[PDB]
Structures are given as structure tokens and as C-alpha cells.
Amino acid sequence: LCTHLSYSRSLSPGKAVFFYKTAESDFVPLRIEVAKISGQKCGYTEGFDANLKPKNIERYELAYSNPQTIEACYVPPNVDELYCRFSLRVEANSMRPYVCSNPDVLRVMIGLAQAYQRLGGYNELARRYSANVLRGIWLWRNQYTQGTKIEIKTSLGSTYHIPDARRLSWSGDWPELEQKQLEQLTSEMAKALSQPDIFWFADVTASLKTGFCQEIFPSQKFTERPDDHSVASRQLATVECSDGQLAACINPQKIGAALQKIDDWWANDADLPLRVHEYGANHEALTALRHPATGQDFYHLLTKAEQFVTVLESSEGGGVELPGEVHYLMAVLVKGGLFQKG
Amino acid sequence: LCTHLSYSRSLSPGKAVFFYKTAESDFVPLRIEVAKIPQTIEACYVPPNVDELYCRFSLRVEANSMRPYVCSNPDVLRVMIGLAQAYQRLGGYNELARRYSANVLRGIWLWRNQYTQGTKIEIKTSLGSTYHIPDARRLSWSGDWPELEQKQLEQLTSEMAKALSQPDIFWFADVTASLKTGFCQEIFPSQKFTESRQLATVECSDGQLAACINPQKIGAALQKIDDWWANDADLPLRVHEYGANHEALTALRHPATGQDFYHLLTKAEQFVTVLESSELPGEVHYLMAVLVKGGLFQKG
RNA sequence: CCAAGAAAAGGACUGGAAGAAAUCAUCCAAGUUGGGGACUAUUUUCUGCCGUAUAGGCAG
């Protein structure tokens, strides 16, 4: 490697905002409320010292409540449906290093991205990204509706429509006349990723049919603990409207983390996909699947580029010849960052 | 045990709103009057000429106690998974579903407002069922329910037993009750917690305010089905890791007895072994009930 | 019961004049804060007559 090497971010959303319509006004934001509640005195160390001596606490001393201040958000009475919207731009920006201080590293990385493009493979990545948009997984914990309808528009004049996204799996065979739209959307994106000077925008709107006063789950703030007993212990993220009203939202990178959740190339057993990560981090299990000790991480693989190009050149393409290691590497170059200090 | 372990909630309501009908419009809110006297006084009662008051809320149930939300230990995880399934296949979800279902049909979530001239409860679900309790004033915790009512308890138990145990079923219920009332009967909505007192309301889409009962106040009523201690059923407690009893200011499963959640959590290896030899004992019923009301189980 | 004992440093005074700190410039690239929850209790505010009246005035 070398002293300077970096790629920029080739695929990205802006943020998502929740709102609803009225008969008199087209845009009314969903907003949050603040309240004091009475909690439970419970859990370990409420009553134990190192699971050894149970603490001295007299019986009556645990019947007391534990008050807390929290923010919360609910849909108001008599609204028929809730809307959520965001925009997405895609750039063909993995073809060339943003910065590179080594002429030989540069010509190789260029040779590789091109060797890959002409054998196919952007179609593979585009199919996986497209599936994640149409499925609706970017709603995170708000997917549990009575019916979810998703509509997509693009700058090239296309429109896509999924009447009900509640049941499309990662692995399986999609219903007819939906399988078809996945192919069409894949084609627009596969192009957007590899041809320069196309300004491609998508506009994604979804509708959520909900319960009478169903709770909504927007992004939380990462905060320090207050000690004035007035500031909430749990705070939610909002945006300002042009007229000063506040609205609940989902953060840009929170939408992004969902869209790029594509990686089932490890251990030769697909399971569930991981968020692309140089070390294969798995948050739910608090572990890592491509620990440097295995030889399967990004940095080990980054140093074999000369060998991969040689293989790709001997292949024909248009088939299933590309190995898991080449796909992994391309996925990381798409989520660009700093790859330095050789 | 281990450092990180969490479950999320598997059963939850939204909030309850009070309203009445007119000949001119179907939803007119019950409102609250305030005099500034800051330090205020306020009141709420059914106004003249309204014969009955309506109360409504929604409920979602999710099969979410089958797997840890977070677990940092592969051996703790293997066991908790084996246990939930060892239990599921012997039944027992029926028992929990029976207990939850009984409370909805009885109507105790109305708290202090149960004293009517006749309360009727109607339930609709996302699978196309409808249930009807013509009069909720006569159903006890313990006793045999009258005919045609015992039957609906079984039918509702079955739908919920599934909602709690099999994934990818999206099960919603919509619960409305009618309170036949007195001449100008006083109504008791949730109070505001402050550092005189104030009452809680919600905003309507048209700007009017309405009286309500908080989500967790409805929830606390539904989950009150713990009577597995001391071989004396009495009335049930709200499920709590320490068996708290607010009325008497005490605790029934005080850690000093060895009967709390945390002592029991560490015997999972032994329970699975028994289930394999299987009868379900109070000790595993308690544990399953706590996992359903999920929370933090950490710093072992 | 001290290298012991005693003690008025005072009166007067002009620092001034004059000055140019200036010319040039890319801080950039990537990122999941999350899981659970009862403000009401041993409360104090009932029962009536006049007045078209949920207005306003009154006995107990």
C-alpha cells in the first residue's frame, strides 16, 4: 500500500420525514410530545451485590416507583394513513480513487474496476440494492402495519409500484408482476453505477396504514445524561419546517445503513446479510465475522489485486465465474473511506 | 449469565379515548373544564342528555419472545432458544393466552370507571372474527363463566395463542366498550404527574381536546396475572421481577426467599432437562411471563 | 536588671521637538444509540328554597 489512498461515497440518501394530509392542507408534520412517568424498581443490582449477598434493603423499600422523563410520539385520533418520504442520488463514483499517491497502485485499481465492469457484476450489486428498496426494510421498527404501499419515481421517467410490500423475502421467489419491476429497476441502477455524467435521482414515498393511536419510532439522539431532572433521559430527532414547526424524522445514515445491508458471502453459508464492514462486524451478536486472524478481512484482500485482475482476464464473463472475494472488495469500494498508512 | 442480554416487548396497546355520538356527527370528544383560580381546579362528567359513553383502544400482539434481542454469549443463547421451543411444543402458550384473554373480556382496564348500569364489550380482529360480551359486570377471576361466554373465551384464546407463538402473522384487535351511565356521572381519566393536580388529554386532528387513559395504564391492567406464589391464589399481581405489591407496600418474591426472577434465570439448564423428560410447574410459567414483558437482564 | 540609659534630616525645582509595515495563498475523505415501566391513596366540599336561566343571590 501507500501513504494516501481514498474513495468517496458513491450512493446516498438525504433524510426521511413523517407527515399526514388533511382535507384543507396538503402537508402537516407528525410531532413529538414530552412526559413524566412512574417506572419500576427492577433488574440486577437493584437488589444484589455480586450475586453474593443480596443487599440489605427492607421489604417496603422496593414498592416505591422510579420516576423518569421521556419523549414519545403517537399518531393522533382519526388519521387514516401516515406518509414517509425521502430522496436518493446515485453516482458512478467507484471507478477512480479520490486521492492516490502511487502511480502503480492507481493503474491497478483502474484496471480492476474496468475488468469487473465488462464481465458483468454491477448487475449483481444493483439487484441486491434494488431488492432492499422495494422490500421496505428501511422503516426499521415501523414495519408492523396493516398494509404498506411503496411507490418510486425517477429522473428518467419511470414509475414503480408495489401494492403491498409486507411479505417480500431476501431469499425466495417474488409474486408475478413484482418480480418484473425488480428487473426494470435493477437496469436503471446498474447503469447509474457504472456510466459517468448521468444525473440519476429517485424519489421514494411509502404509505403506512396504522392502528387507532399506534406509536411511531423515529431516530433517537445520542446524548449525555442530564442531572437537572427536567431534560428527558430519552430524546428524539426532529427537523424544522420552513415555517418553524417541528417534525419527526429518520437520520440519513440510518436509512443508509438499511439500504447497504448486503453481505452474505462469508463462511459459505448465507444466513442473514451483514452491513458491509471492513472487519465483518455483527452488532446483534456483539462479534466479528472477518477478524484479521482469519485472513478474510478487507486489508488482506486489498493486497492481492494484481492476482485478481490476472484471473478476471483469463475468465470469459457473462456467467457465474466471479468469486466471492471480488464481489466483497467492490462492495467496500462503493462505500468509500480511508484506506491508508501503508 | 453474561454482560449483555435484552428482550423487547411482545404485547402492547396504544391509548384509550373517551367519546360520544350525536345525531349530527359520529365522534364528539368528552372534554375537561379548567378554572385558573397555575393553581387550578378542574372537572369532567358526562353532560346532560348523553345516555352512553364510548371508550376505544387498539392492540397488537407479536411473537417476539422466541428470541433475544441482544445476547453477548453463545452458550446463553443456545439455552434460551432451546427453552422457548421446549415449552412451546408442550402447550402453555394456551395458558398464558387464556389468562390475557380473560382480562380483556372482563373489562378491568376501565379501572375506576367500572361502576355503570351495564357495560358491553365488543372485539374485532384482523382475521375476521367478532366477539361480543353482552354484560361484563359478572365475570370473575375464578369461577365458571356462563354458557356462550365460556365459548368465546376459548375462541379468543386460540387466536392469541397463535399470535404469541408463530411469526409473520400480523394480528390486530380493536376493542370498544360501551358504558351505560347515570344522570351526570363523573369520569376518571389518567392524571398528570407533576413536581393542585391536572388531568391528561389528547389533541384531535381538528384541534379539540379529549380525555384519555395512558398506554401503560391499560397495559398494567392486562398483564396482571401472577398468582403462582405461596400456594395461595388470592388475586394476581402485576408481573414484576420481585413480586411487588403496591397496596400492602411489600414484595412477595423478595430476593431473600430465592423466589425472584434472577435466581430462577440461572437454572435454565435444569428446566430444559425436565421439559425433555415430560405437569408444567409454576417456576417455568413465571419465567415465560417475564420474558414476554421484556426488558434489560444484564451485568451478570 | 538587655554592646545598658537620652535623641525632629529638613527647605526649592517645566523633558521636549519630528514620522507610511507591506506584496501572495484550496482542510479534505467514511460512519446505526438501543432495550422496560400505574400519580392516586383513609379522600374531607354533601342537602335544599327564590330566580325564564348550568347567569346572579341565599338558609342550614
Side-chain angles (χ1 to χ4, degrees):
Chain A
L1 305 178
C2 64
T3 301
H4 299 282
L5 180 64
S6 64
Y7 283 76
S8 69
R9 182 182 65 198
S10 68
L11 187 151
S12 66
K15 64 181 72 178
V17 177
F18 286 107
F19 66 93
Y20 67 95
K21 297 178 182 295
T22 63
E24 292 80 42
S25 178
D26 194 67
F27 182 87
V28 179
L30 183 68
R31 66 189 64 196
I32 66 170
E33 65 182 47
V34 181
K36 291 174 65 175
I37 60 86
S38 297
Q40 294 185 331
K41 293 180 74 170
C42 61
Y44 192 66
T45 78
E46 184 67 30
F48 292 88
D49 291 346
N51 194 33
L52 196 222
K53 270 347 257 200
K55 269 125 85 327
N56 280 355
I57 341 266
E58 178 59 274
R59 298 292 180 85
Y60 83 86
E61 293 173 344
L62 299 178
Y64 286 135
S65 68
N66 185 6
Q68 298 287 269
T69 300
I70 62 172
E71 299 189 353
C73 182
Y74 297 87
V75 176
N78 302 320
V79 176
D80 290 339
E81 65 180 6
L82 193 67
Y83 300 98
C84 182
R85 184 159 74 100
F86 75 96
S87 65
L88 172 67
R89 292 173 296 180
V90 178
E91 291 280 328
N93 203 19
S94 64
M95 296 297 173
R96 189 181 179 94
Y98 178 58
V99 177
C100 183
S101 62
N102 185 296
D104 288 303
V105 172
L106 179 60
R107 71 184 176 85
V108 171
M109 290 305 292
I110 292 169
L112 178 59
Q114 292 175 0
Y116 182 85
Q117 188 275 324
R118 72 177 179 86
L119 302 176
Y122 278 107
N123 290 338
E124 179 66 24
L125 290 174
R127 180 184 66 80
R128 293 164 185 256
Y129 287 119
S130 297
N132 284 348
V133 174
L134 292 173
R135 285 172 70 213
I137 64 171
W138 39 271
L139 295 170
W140 291 97
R141 184 172 181 180
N142 299 281
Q143 293 178 76
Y144 205 72
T145 72
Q146 296 180 353
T148 299
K149 181 172 73 177
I150 298 175
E151 182 180 1
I152 302 172
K153 294 180 174 67
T154 68
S155 64
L156 299 178
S158 297
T159 303
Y160 305 95
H161 191 83
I162 302 298
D164 186 341
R166 285 186 293 172
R167 293 183 174 83
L168 302 174
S169 65
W170 177 245
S171 297
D173 296 296
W174 291 12
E176 292 299 353
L177 307 181
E178 297 177 1
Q179 184 72 57
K180 291 182 187 299
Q181 293 185 67
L182 181 60
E183 292 178 359
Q184 290 178 28
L185 183 58
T186 298
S187 295
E188 286 188 46
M189 191 169 291
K191 295 180 182 297
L193 288 172
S194 62
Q195 295 180 6
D197 300 342
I198 299 171
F199 297 81
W200 188 82
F201 291 80
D203 177 281
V204 180
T205 302
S207 297
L208 307 179
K209 183 176 183 291
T210 66
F212 185 70
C213 294
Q214 295 295 100
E215 186 169 347
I216 303 299
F217 302 101
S219 294
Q220 296 181 40
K221 292 184 179 177
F222 186 108
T223 67
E224 184 56 272
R225 182 173 66 87
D227 59 357
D228 66 8
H229 310 297
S230 296
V231 173
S233 295
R234 187 185 71 195
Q235 298 170 33
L236 305 176
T238 64
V239 300
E240 295 181 2
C241 299
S242 67
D243 69 9
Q245 294 184 80
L246 279 300
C249 69
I250 298 170
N251 289 331
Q253 65 277 32
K254 190 72 168 184
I255 296 298
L259 293 178
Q260 295 185 5
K261 186 171 184 175
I262 299 164
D263 183 352
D264 55 1
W265 292 299
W266 54 279
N268 201 28
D269 185 355
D271 200 69
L272 299 178
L274 302 177
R275 196 265 191 276
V276 174
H277 192 281
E278 290 83 33
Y279 297 123
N282 175 325
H283 288 294
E284 183 176 3
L286 275 66
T287 189
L289 279 305
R290 292 179 183 269
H291 191 280
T294 65
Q296 299 300 307
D297 73 8
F298 180 73
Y299 291 100
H300 277 287
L301 290 172
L302 185 60
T303 67
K304 293 172 66 66
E306 290 177 342
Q307 293 174 311
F308 285 116
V309 170
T310 300
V311 171
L312 292 176
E313 288 299 312
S314 296
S315 74
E316 294 181 354
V320 297
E321 292 182 314
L322 300 174
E325 293 79 4
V326 168
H327 286 303
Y328 175 72
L329 286 174
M330 291 304 294
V332 175
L333 292 176
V334 169
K335 173 192 76 72
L338 306 181
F339 307 124
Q340 65 188 78
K341 181 68 176 177
Chain B
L1 300 178
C2 62
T3 300
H4 301 278
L5 179 63
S6 302
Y7 282 77
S8 295
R9 182 182 65 198
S10 295
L11 187 151
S12 66
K15 64 182 69 180
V17 177
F18 289 106
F19 67 95
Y20 65 93
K21 299 183 179 182
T22 63
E24 296 174 352
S25 180
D26 289 345
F27 181 89
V28 180
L30 182 67
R31 64 174 171 85
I32 302 179
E33 296 179 345
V34 181
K36 183 169 71 172
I37 297 300
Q39 286 291 316
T40 187
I41 62 173
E42 59 191 71
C44 185
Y45 60 99
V46 175
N49 307 325
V50 179
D51 292 342
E52 62 182 358
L53 190 67
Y54 294 81
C55 182
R56 181 177 181 170
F57 76 96
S58 64
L59 171 67
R60 292 181 295 103
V61 177
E62 187 176 2
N64 202 22
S65 64
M66 294 297 171
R67 186 180 183 94
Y69 179 58
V70 176
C71 183
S72 61
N73 185 297
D75 292 331
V76 172
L77 179 60
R78 186 179 299 107
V79 173
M80 291 304 290
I81 296 298
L83 181 59
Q85 291 183 324
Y87 183 91
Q88 185 272 324
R89 69 189 181 187
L90 299 176
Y93 275 106
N94 290 342
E95 178 58 7
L96 290 174
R98 182 184 71 81
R99 290 166 188 255
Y100 290 127
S101 296
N103 283 345
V104 173
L105 296 176
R106 284 177 69 220
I108 63 172
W109 41 272
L110 290 173
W111 290 95
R112 293 189 66 186
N113 300 285
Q114 294 176 73
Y115 301 88
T116 72
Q117 301 300 309
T119 298
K120 179 185 289 183
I121 298 175
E122 183 178 0
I123 302 173
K124 295 179 175 66
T125 68
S126 63
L127 299 178
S129 297
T130 302
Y131 302 100
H132 181 200
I133 303 300
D135 189 334
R137 292 178 299 172
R138 302 299 179 86
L139 303 175
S140 63
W141 176 245
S142 297
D144 291 339
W145 292 9
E147 192 58 277
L148 305 182
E149 297 179 5
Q150 184 71 50
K151 295 294 186 292
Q152 291 181 77
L153 180 61
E154 291 182 349
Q155 291 176 33
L156 182 58
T157 299
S158 295
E159 286 187 46
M160 191 170 291
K162 293 302 296 183
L164 290 172
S165 60
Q166 181 177 342
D168 292 336
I169 300 170
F170 298 84
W171 191 81
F172 291 83
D174 289 345
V175 180
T176 301
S178 296
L179 286 76
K180 180 181 175 182
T181 190
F183 181 71
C184 293
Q185 191 166 358
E186 187 172 3
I187 302 300
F188 300 92
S190 293
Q191 297 184 32
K192 191 180 297 181
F193 183 96
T194 66
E195 301 294 323
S196 64
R197 65 169 174 83
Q198 300 181 8
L199 302 176
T201 63
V202 300
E203 295 182 58
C204 298
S205 66
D206 68 11
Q208 296 184 85
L209 300 179
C212 67
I213 298 171
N214 291 335
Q216 63 281 33
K217 190 69 170 289
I218 296 298
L222 293 176
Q223 294 185 358
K224 180 167 70 175
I225 61 167
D226 181 359
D227 59 4
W228 289 297
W229 47 278
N231 298 320
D232 289 345
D234 199 70
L235 285 310
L237 301 177
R238 194 262 190 277
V239 174
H240 190 283
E241 294 82 35
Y242 297 135
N245 178 323
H246 284 290
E247 180 181 1
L249 301 178
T250 189
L252 276 305
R253 293 179 182 274
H254 192 282
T257 65
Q259 298 298 305
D260 73 6
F261 180 73
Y262 292 97
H263 284 78
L264 291 170
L265 184 60
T266 66
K267 295 180 181 178
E269 292 173 353
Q270 294 174 341
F271 289 120
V272 170
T273 300
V274 170
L275 292 174
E276 288 182 353
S277 69
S278 76
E279 295 179 1
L280 295 174
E283 290 169 340
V284 301
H285 284 301
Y286 177 73
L287 285 171
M288 291 304 292
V290 174
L291 292 175
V292 170
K293 175 190 78 72
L296 299 177
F297 304 131
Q298 64 184 41
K299 179 72 172 181

